[PDB]
């Protein structure tokens with residue numbers, strides 16, 4: 001397993017047709033997972049499955065600019081389960097990040113950070129055993 005939190009450098013940032021694949025297994029009794037696509041200290045795209053927010057499971061997405069969180073985007077479809085292996089695929093499209101989990105489309109998140117070639121790191125954190133994290137151009 002990789003050591004979490006794990007930094008995956010994205011050389012030259014992201015660009016449409018770039019596919020990021022994250023393979024891992026959710027720990028037992030998980031509380032949270034996070035993917036943080038970073039532009040320096042800013043978070044262009046925060047993808048945050050929350051296993052217990054007032055006893056409901058929700059994915060929170062958001063952007064952090066100059067240490068300030070923005071307006072959350074919430075999805076109640078929640079494909080993750082404690083103890084089970086998952087695959088997250090993040091495909092960069094021209095207007096959004098497109099996210100599929102276990103080969104099923106989950107959500108999209110409009111680009112708020114516009115300098116895609118400056119989103120140069122992906123932070124992977126939380127209650128997972130991380131098998132692998134990689135990218136390919138499709």
Ligand SMILES: CO[C@@H]1O[C@H](CO)[C@H](O)[C@H](OC(=O)c2ccc(C)cc2)[C@@H]1OC(=O)c1ccc(F)cc1[N+](=O)[O-]
Nearest residue numbers: 031032046048049050052053054060061062069070072
């Ligand atoms: C207003 O709350 C914040 O919302 C942000 C998204 O708009 C971020 O998700 C942020 O988390 C971190 O940046 C963060 C968290 C932990 C670490 C180890 C490092 C960084 C924080 O979330 C929680 O604290 C939260 C609130 C209610 C919840 F049920 C669950 C969570 N949670 O997952 O932390």
Ligand SMILES: [Cl-]
Nearest residue numbers: 001002003006
């Ligand atoms: Cl490692």
Ligand SMILES: [Cl-]
Nearest residue numbers: 112113114115
């Ligand atoms: Cl920008």
